[PDB]
Amino acid sequence: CTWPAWEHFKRAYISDGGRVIDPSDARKITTSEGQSYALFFALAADDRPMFDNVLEWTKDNLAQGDPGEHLPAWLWGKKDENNWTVLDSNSASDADIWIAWSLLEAGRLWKEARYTTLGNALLNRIAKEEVVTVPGLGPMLLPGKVGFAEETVWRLNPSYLPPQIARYLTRFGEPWTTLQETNHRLLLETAPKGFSPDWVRYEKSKGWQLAPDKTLISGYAAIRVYLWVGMMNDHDAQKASLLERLKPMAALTAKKGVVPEKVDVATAQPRGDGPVGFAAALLPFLQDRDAQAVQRQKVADHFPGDDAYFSYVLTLFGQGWDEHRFRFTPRGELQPDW
Ligand SMILES: OC[C@H]1O[C@@H](O[C@H]2[C@H](O)[C@@H](O)[C@H](O[C@H]3[C@H](O)[C@@H](O)[C@H](O[C@H]4[C@H](O)[C@@H](O)[C@@H](O)O[C@@H]4CO)O[C@@H]3CO)O[C@@H]2CO)[C@H](O)[C@@H](O)[C@@H]1O
Ligand SMILES: OC[C@H]1O[C@@H](O[C@H]2[C@H](O)[C@@H](O)[C@H](O[C@H]3[C@H](O)[C@@H](O)[C@H](O)O[C@@H]3CO)O[C@@H]2CO)[C@H](O)[C@@H](O)[C@@H]1O
Ligand SMILES: OC[C@H]1O[C@@H](O[C@H]2[C@H](O)[C@@H](O)[C@H](O)O[C@@H]2CO)[C@H](O)[C@@H](O)[C@@H]1O
């Protein structure tokens, strides 16, 4: 029947009108990411009323009524004391992808063609507006429709296309067929010490820009890479290759029992202790039963409060998967626990 942590999330973080609010920002923001994760969780929980409430808010307030015609603006909130509105009209493609996947899986599982039609239109718009062929790489997913592509340099975010979602989307043909391959190579090629970067640049005639840099780190974006990989179905033939490349994050977490806040991608040097959400995010990733139980204790004893949006959503994914609240099939479909 119910998923208690999701029920609490609805009460503490989602407005009556269907917007996920990050309370830690003075502008009391909603992001397209937060909306997209709420759609996913509502679908996993078999919660069509909240799915629809969140979807309608997203459509009307981020997408000018129709995500098939307008990619959702990524940031919304208090712009001035008399104006709650879009704060940045640019898209975030990780959210766009999670919205598209959630609509397509809701349409399939709830047998609702309206969701399928909207998911298809949004997917097509993602391909049109934030997928480009990068010389040397092929088709790649940009992090947003503006701001990440210049004539000779591009910036990517390895957390933005979960491998299981890339595998699911290949059913729609190109560019998704090729994007699944370029995404897999992105993940393998940009983790030279086994740590995936938050953001990474590719430069024409030069390749991936992996030199040591205080900004080339596995942090609050890339923690999601390990989470997505951990939640891949074991029968996905590529899960093993990704676990093997990212194994240093598992070995480092097991060593002192603390997920690092930031790891230098070029040197593997860690700094800081990650929040509880990082512990939960590694639950599906850690294959060793003892290392995973150490992190489980931290999530149990330091479960995120109502002032911790990001750790809460990482916990709904990571603890949710740890509790069998949802699974992915080998093709990246939702295998629901309804
Ligand atoms: O125009 C001046 C300047 O713009 C640069 O492009 C910007 C672009 O204007 C801006 O919209 C975009 O903002 C990103 C933001 O940095 C990013 O953090 C956010 O990502 C979401 C995502 O959903 C998350 O899951 C995770 O990434 O965090 C947030 C949600 O919390 O997405 C927005 C939208 O893409 O950043 C661009 C690059 O900085 C130009 O590059 C520059 O040349 C110009 O000078
Ligand atoms: O016109 C564009 C869309 O506007 C939607 O209404 C928004 C209001 O314009 C906005 O003033 C209000 O802001 C709220 C905020 O939701 C709430 O969390 C905060 O505490 O108080 C603010 C001020 O009341 O948000 C709503 C959306 O939540 C229309 O609903 C929509 O149809 C229309 O397309
Ligand atoms: O880009 C990753 C991610 O950051 C989230 O907020 C972080 C923030 O990056 C960090 O500066 C702050 O100190 O802690 C929080 C998380 O505990 C943000 O909420 C996400 O939407 C964003 O995707």
Coordinates of C-alpha atoms and ligand atoms in Angstrom, one line a residue:
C1 CA 0.0 0.0 0.0
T2 CA 1.9 3.1 1.2
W3 CA 5.5 4.2 1.1
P4 CA 6.0 6.1 4.4
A5 CA 9.0 8.2 3.4
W6 CA 7.2 9.3 0.2
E7 CA 4.0 10.1 2.2
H8 CA 6.1 12.3 4.4
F9 CA 7.8 13.9 1.5
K10 CA 4.5 14.8 0.0
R11 CA 3.4 16.4 3.3
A12 CA 6.6 18.3 4.1
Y13 CA 7.9 19.3 0.6
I14 CA 5.1 19.4 -1.9
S15 CA 2.7 22.3 -2.0
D16 CA -1.0 21.8 -2.3
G17 CA -0.8 22.9 -5.9
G18 CA 1.9 20.3 -6.8
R19 CA 5.3 22.0 -6.6
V20 CA 8.3 20.5 -4.8
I21 CA 9.8 23.3 -2.7
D22 CA 13.4 23.4 -1.6
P23 CA 13.1 25.2 1.7
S24 CA 16.8 26.0 2.0
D25 CA 16.6 28.7 -0.6
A26 CA 15.2 32.1 0.4
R27 CA 13.3 32.2 -2.9
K28 CA 11.6 28.9 -1.9
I29 CA 12.4 27.5 -5.2
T30 CA 11.0 24.7 -7.4
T31 CA 13.3 23.0 -9.9
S32 CA 12.5 20.9 -12.9
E33 CA 14.7 18.3 -11.2
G34 CA 12.5 18.3 -8.1
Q35 CA 9.3 18.0 -10.2
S36 CA 10.9 15.1 -12.3
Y37 CA 11.9 13.2 -9.1
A38 CA 8.4 13.6 -7.7
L39 CA 6.9 12.2 -10.8
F40 CA 9.2 9.2 -10.6
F41 CA 8.4 8.6 -6.9
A42 CA 4.7 9.0 -7.4
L43 CA 4.8 6.5 -10.2
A44 CA 6.9 4.1 -8.1
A45 CA 4.4 4.5 -5.3
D46 CA 1.4 3.9 -7.6
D47 CA 0.2 7.4 -6.6
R48 CA -1.6 8.7 -9.7
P49 CA -3.2 11.7 -7.8
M50 CA 0.1 13.2 -6.8
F51 CA 1.6 12.3 -10.2
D52 CA -1.1 14.3 -11.9
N53 CA -0.8 17.2 -9.3
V54 CA 2.9 17.5 -9.9
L55 CA 2.6 17.1 -13.7
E56 CA 0.0 19.8 -14.0
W57 CA 2.0 22.2 -11.9
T58 CA 5.1 21.5 -14.1
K59 CA 3.2 21.9 -17.3
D60 CA 1.6 25.2 -16.3
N61 CA 4.4 26.9 -14.4
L62 CA 7.6 25.6 -16.1
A63 CA 6.5 24.7 -19.7
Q64 CA 4.0 27.4 -20.7
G65 CA 1.3 24.7 -20.6
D66 CA 2.9 22.0 -22.6
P67 CA 6.3 20.3 -22.2
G68 CA 5.9 18.9 -25.7
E69 CA 6.1 22.5 -27.1
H70 CA 8.5 24.1 -24.5
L71 CA 11.2 22.3 -22.5
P72 CA 10.5 23.0 -18.8
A73 CA 12.3 26.0 -17.3
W74 CA 14.6 24.7 -14.6
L75 CA 14.2 27.2 -11.9
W76 CA 11.0 28.9 -10.4
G77 CA 10.4 30.8 -7.2
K78 CA 10.2 34.2 -5.6
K79 CA 11.7 36.8 -8.0
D80 CA 10.6 39.8 -6.0
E81 CA 8.1 40.3 -3.1
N82 CA 5.2 40.5 -5.5
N83 CA 6.3 38.1 -8.2
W84 CA 6.6 34.3 -8.0
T85 CA 7.6 33.1 -11.5
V86 CA 10.3 31.5 -13.7
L87 CA 13.7 32.5 -12.4
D88 CA 15.7 31.0 -15.3
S89 CA 14.0 29.9 -18.5
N90 CA 16.8 27.5 -19.6
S91 CA 16.2 23.8 -19.3
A92 CA 18.1 21.1 -17.3
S93 CA 18.2 18.0 -19.4
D94 CA 18.4 15.6 -16.6
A95 CA 15.0 16.7 -15.4
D96 CA 13.7 16.7 -19.0
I97 CA 14.8 13.1 -19.4
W98 CA 13.3 12.0 -16.0
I99 CA 10.0 13.7 -16.9
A100 CA 9.9 12.0 -20.4
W101 CA 10.7 8.6 -18.9
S102 CA 8.2 8.9 -16.2
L103 CA 5.5 10.0 -18.6
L104 CA 6.2 7.1 -20.9
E105 CA 6.2 4.6 -18.1
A106 CA 3.1 6.1 -16.5
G107 CA 1.4 5.9 -19.9
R108 CA 2.4 2.2 -20.3
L109 CA 1.6 1.1 -16.7
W110 CA -1.5 3.1 -16.1
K111 CA -2.7 2.6 -19.6
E112 CA -3.1 6.3 -20.2
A113 CA -2.4 7.4 -23.8
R114 CA -2.3 11.1 -22.8
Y115 CA 0.9 10.5 -20.8
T116 CA 2.4 8.5 -23.7
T117 CA 1.6 11.3 -26.2
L118 CA 3.1 14.0 -24.0
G119 CA 6.2 11.9 -23.2
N120 CA 6.8 11.3 -26.9
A121 CA 6.5 15.0 -27.7
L122 CA 8.8 15.9 -24.9
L123 CA 11.3 13.3 -25.9
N124 CA 11.3 14.6 -29.4
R125 CA 11.9 18.1 -28.2
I126 CA 14.8 17.0 -26.0
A127 CA 16.4 15.5 -29.1
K128 CA 15.8 18.6 -31.1
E129 CA 16.9 21.2 -28.6
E130 CA 19.5 19.6 -26.3
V131 CA 21.1 16.8 -28.3
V132 CA 23.9 17.8 -30.7
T133 CA 26.5 15.9 -32.7
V134 CA 29.9 16.9 -31.1
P135 CA 32.8 16.5 -33.5
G136 CA 34.9 13.6 -32.3
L137 CA 32.2 12.2 -30.0
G138 CA 29.0 11.9 -32.0
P139 CA 25.6 12.6 -30.6
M140 CA 25.7 13.9 -27.0
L141 CA 23.1 15.1 -24.5
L142 CA 23.8 18.7 -23.5
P143 CA 23.0 19.7 -19.9
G144 CA 20.6 22.4 -21.1
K145 CA 19.3 23.9 -24.3
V146 CA 21.6 27.0 -23.9
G147 CA 24.9 27.6 -22.1
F148 CA 26.8 24.3 -22.6
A149 CA 27.9 24.4 -26.3
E150 CA 30.4 26.7 -28.0
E151 CA 32.2 26.4 -31.3
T152 CA 35.2 24.5 -29.9
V153 CA 34.2 23.3 -26.3
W154 CA 31.2 21.5 -24.8
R155 CA 30.4 20.8 -21.1
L156 CA 28.6 17.6 -20.0
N157 CA 27.3 16.2 -16.7
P158 CA 27.8 12.5 -16.4
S159 CA 24.9 12.2 -13.9
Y160 CA 22.3 13.4 -16.5
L161 CA 21.5 10.2 -18.4
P162 CA 21.1 7.2 -16.1
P163 CA 22.3 4.1 -18.0
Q164 CA 19.0 2.3 -17.5
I165 CA 17.1 5.2 -18.9
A166 CA 19.5 5.4 -21.9
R167 CA 18.8 1.7 -22.5
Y168 CA 15.0 2.2 -22.2
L169 CA 15.1 5.1 -24.7
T170 CA 16.8 3.1 -27.4
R171 CA 13.3 1.7 -28.2
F172 CA 12.6 5.1 -29.8
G173 CA 15.4 4.8 -32.4
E174 CA 17.9 7.6 -33.2
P175 CA 19.3 9.6 -31.6
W176 CA 18.6 7.4 -28.5
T177 CA 20.3 4.3 -30.0
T178 CA 23.6 6.1 -30.5
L179 CA 23.2 8.2 -27.3
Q180 CA 23.1 5.1 -25.2
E181 CA 26.6 4.1 -26.7
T182 CA 28.1 7.6 -26.4
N183 CA 26.7 7.9 -22.8
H184 CA 28.4 4.6 -21.8
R185 CA 31.7 5.8 -23.2
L186 CA 31.3 9.1 -21.5
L187 CA 31.0 7.3 -18.1
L188 CA 34.0 5.0 -18.8
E189 CA 36.3 7.6 -20.4
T190 CA 35.9 10.5 -17.9
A191 CA 36.5 8.5 -14.6
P192 CA 40.3 8.0 -15.0
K193 CA 40.7 7.2 -11.2
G194 CA 37.3 5.5 -10.8
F195 CA 35.5 8.7 -9.8
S196 CA 33.0 10.3 -12.2
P197 CA 33.1 14.2 -12.5
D198 CA 30.2 16.5 -11.7
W199 CA 30.9 18.3 -15.0
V200 CA 33.5 17.7 -17.7
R201 CA 34.5 19.5 -20.9
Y202 CA 35.4 18.2 -24.3
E203 CA 37.5 20.4 -26.5
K204 CA 37.7 20.2 -30.3
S205 CA 41.0 18.6 -31.4
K206 CA 42.0 18.0 -27.8
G207 CA 39.4 15.6 -26.3
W208 CA 38.3 15.2 -22.8
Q209 CA 39.7 17.8 -20.4
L210 CA 40.8 15.7 -17.5
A211 CA 43.7 17.5 -16.1
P212 CA 43.7 18.1 -12.3
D213 CA 41.4 20.9 -11.4
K214 CA 39.8 21.8 -8.1
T215 CA 36.5 21.9 -10.2
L216 CA 36.9 18.4 -11.7
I217 CA 35.4 16.6 -8.8
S218 CA 33.0 13.8 -7.9
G219 CA 30.5 15.8 -5.7
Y220 CA 26.8 16.6 -5.5
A221 CA 26.1 15.9 -9.2
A222 CA 28.2 12.8 -9.7
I223 CA 27.1 11.1 -6.5
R224 CA 24.1 10.2 -8.7
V225 CA 26.2 8.3 -11.2
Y226 CA 27.0 5.6 -8.6
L227 CA 23.4 5.5 -7.6
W228 CA 22.1 5.0 -11.1
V229 CA 24.7 2.3 -11.8
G230 CA 23.8 0.5 -8.6
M231 CA 20.1 0.5 -9.5
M232 CA 20.7 -1.0 -12.9
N233 CA 19.2 -4.5 -13.3
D234 CA 22.0 -7.2 -12.9
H235 CA 21.0 -8.6 -16.3
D236 CA 21.9 -5.4 -18.1
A237 CA 25.0 -6.6 -19.8
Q238 CA 26.8 -3.2 -19.2
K239 CA 26.2 -2.9 -15.4
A240 CA 29.3 -4.9 -14.6
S241 CA 31.7 -2.7 -16.7
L242 CA 30.4 0.4 -15.0
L243 CA 30.7 -1.1 -11.5
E244 CA 34.2 -2.1 -12.3
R245 CA 35.3 1.3 -13.5
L246 CA 33.7 3.0 -10.5
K247 CA 34.9 0.5 -7.9
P248 CA 37.4 3.0 -6.3
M249 CA 34.4 4.9 -4.9
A250 CA 33.2 1.7 -3.2
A251 CA 36.6 0.9 -1.9
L252 CA 37.1 4.4 -0.5
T253 CA 33.7 4.5 1.2
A254 CA 34.3 1.1 2.7
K255 CA 37.7 2.1 4.0
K256 CA 36.6 4.6 6.6
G257 CA 32.8 4.1 6.4
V258 CA 32.2 7.6 5.2
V259 CA 31.2 8.6 1.6
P260 CA 33.4 11.5 0.7
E261 CA 31.9 14.9 -0.1
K262 CA 34.2 15.6 -3.0
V263 CA 36.8 13.5 -4.7
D264 CA 39.4 14.9 -7.1
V265 CA 38.7 13.1 -10.4
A266 CA 42.4 13.3 -11.6
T267 CA 44.1 12.4 -8.4
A268 CA 41.5 10.4 -6.4
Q269 CA 42.1 12.6 -3.4
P270 CA 39.0 12.9 -1.2
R271 CA 37.9 15.8 0.9
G272 CA 35.0 16.2 3.4
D273 CA 32.2 14.0 4.6
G274 CA 29.1 13.7 2.4
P275 CA 25.7 14.3 3.8
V276 CA 23.3 11.5 4.7
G277 CA 21.9 11.5 1.1
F278 CA 25.3 10.4 -0.2
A279 CA 25.1 7.4 2.2
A280 CA 21.7 6.5 0.9
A281 CA 22.8 7.1 -2.8
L282 CA 25.5 4.5 -2.4
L283 CA 23.2 1.8 -1.0
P284 CA 22.4 0.3 -4.4
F285 CA 25.9 0.8 -5.6
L286 CA 27.8 -1.0 -2.8
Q287 CA 27.9 -4.7 -3.5
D288 CA 29.6 -5.7 -0.2
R289 CA 27.1 -6.5 2.5
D290 CA 29.1 -5.1 5.3
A291 CA 29.9 -1.8 3.6
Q292 CA 26.4 -1.4 2.5
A293 CA 25.2 -2.1 6.1
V294 CA 27.5 0.7 7.5
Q295 CA 25.8 3.2 5.2
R296 CA 22.4 1.7 6.0
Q297 CA 22.9 2.5 9.7
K298 CA 23.8 6.1 8.8
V299 CA 20.6 6.6 6.8
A300 CA 18.6 4.9 9.6
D301 CA 20.0 7.2 12.4
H302 CA 20.3 10.4 10.4
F303 CA 17.3 10.3 8.2
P304 CA 16.9 13.6 6.4
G305 CA 14.6 16.2 8.0
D306 CA 12.3 18.7 6.4
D307 CA 15.1 21.2 5.7
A308 CA 17.1 18.9 3.4
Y309 CA 15.5 18.5 0.0
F310 CA 18.5 17.0 -1.8
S311 CA 19.4 14.4 0.9
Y312 CA 15.7 13.6 1.0
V313 CA 15.4 12.8 -2.7
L314 CA 18.7 10.9 -2.7
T315 CA 17.3 8.9 0.2
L316 CA 14.0 8.2 -1.6
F317 CA 16.0 6.8 -4.5
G318 CA 18.7 4.9 -2.5
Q319 CA 16.8 3.8 0.6
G320 CA 13.8 3.2 -1.7
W321 CA 15.7 0.8 -3.8
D322 CA 17.3 -0.8 -0.7
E323 CA 13.7 -1.4 0.5
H324 CA 12.5 -2.8 -2.9
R325 CA 10.2 0.2 -3.4
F326 CA 10.9 -0.1 -7.2
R327 CA 13.2 -2.0 -9.6
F328 CA 14.3 -1.5 -13.1
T329 CA 14.0 -4.2 -15.7
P330 CA 17.0 -5.2 -17.9
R331 CA 15.6 -2.8 -20.6
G332 CA 15.2 0.1 -18.2
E333 CA 11.4 -0.2 -17.7
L334 CA 9.9 0.3 -14.2
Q335 CA 9.4 -3.1 -12.6
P336 CA 6.8 -1.8 -10.0
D337 CA 6.4 -3.0 -6.4
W338 CA 2.7 -2.2 -6.3
Ligands
LIG1 O1 24.5 33.8 -20.0 C1 25.6 33.9 -19.2 C2 26.3 32.7 -19.0 O2 25.4 31.6 -19.3 C3 26.1 30.3 -19.3 O3 25.1 29.3 -19.5 C4 24.4 28.9 -18.3 C5 22.9 29.0 -18.4 O4 22.5 30.4 -18.6 C6 22.2 28.5 -17.2 O5 20.8 28.5 -17.5 C7 22.6 27.1 -16.8 O6 22.0 26.9 -15.6 C8 22.1 25.5 -15.2 C9 22.6 25.3 -13.8 O7 24.1 25.7 -13.8 C10 22.5 23.9 -13.4 O8 23.1 23.7 -12.1 C11 21.1 23.4 -13.3 O9 21.0 22.1 -13.1 C12 19.9 21.5 -12.4 C13 19.8 20.1 -12.7 O10 18.5 19.7 -12.8 C14 20.2 19.3 -11.5 O11 19.8 18.0 -11.4 C15 21.6 19.8 -11.1 O12 22.4 20.0 -12.2 O13 21.2 21.0 -10.4 C16 20.1 21.8 -11.0 C17 18.8 21.7 -10.2 O14 19.2 21.9 -8.9 O15 20.6 23.6 -14.7 C18 20.7 24.9 -15.2 C19 20.1 24.9 -16.6 O16 20.8 24.1 -17.4 O17 24.1 27.1 -16.6 C20 24.8 27.5 -17.9 C21 26.2 27.3 -17.7 O18 26.7 27.9 -16.6 C22 27.1 30.2 -20.4 O19 27.8 29.0 -20.4 C23 28.0 31.3 -20.3 O20 28.9 31.3 -21.5 C24 27.4 32.6 -20.1 O21 28.4 33.6 -19.8
LIG2 O1 0.5 32.4 -15.1 C1 1.4 31.4 -15.1 C2 0.9 30.3 -14.1 O2 0.7 31.0 -12.8 C3 0.1 30.0 -11.8 O3 -0.1 30.6 -10.5 C4 1.1 30.8 -9.8 C5 1.1 32.2 -9.3 O4 1.2 33.2 -10.4 C6 2.1 32.5 -8.3 O5 1.8 33.9 -7.7 C7 2.0 31.6 -7.1 O6 3.1 31.7 -6.2 C8 2.8 31.2 -4.9 C9 3.6 29.9 -4.6 O7 3.1 28.8 -5.4 C10 3.5 29.5 -3.2 O8 4.3 28.4 -3.0 C11 4.0 30.7 -2.3 O9 3.9 30.4 -1.0 O10 3.1 31.8 -2.5 C12 3.2 32.3 -3.9 C13 2.2 33.5 -4.1 O11 0.9 33.2 -3.8 O12 2.2 30.2 -7.7 C14 1.1 29.8 -8.6 C15 1.5 28.4 -9.0 O13 1.8 27.6 -7.8 C16 -1.2 29.4 -12.3 O14 -1.7 28.4 -11.4 C17 -1.1 28.8 -13.6 O15 -2.4 28.4 -14.1 C18 -0.5 29.8 -14.6 O16 -0.3 29.1 -15.8
LIG3 O1 24.4 19.9 -8.5 C1 24.0 18.9 -7.5 C2 22.8 19.2 -6.6 O2 23.1 20.1 -5.6 C3 22.0 20.2 -4.6 O3 22.2 21.0 -3.5 C4 23.4 20.6 -2.8 C5 24.4 21.7 -3.2 O4 25.0 21.4 -4.5 C6 25.5 21.9 -2.2 O5 26.1 23.1 -2.6 C7 24.9 22.1 -0.8 O6 25.9 22.4 0.0 O7 24.2 20.9 -0.4 C8 23.1 20.5 -1.3 C9 22.7 19.0 -1.0 O8 22.8 18.5 0.3 C10 20.7 20.6 -5.3 O9 19.6 20.6 -4.4 C11 20.3 19.7 -6.4 O10 19.1 20.2 -6.9 C12 21.5 19.7 -7.3 O11 21.1 18.8 -8.3

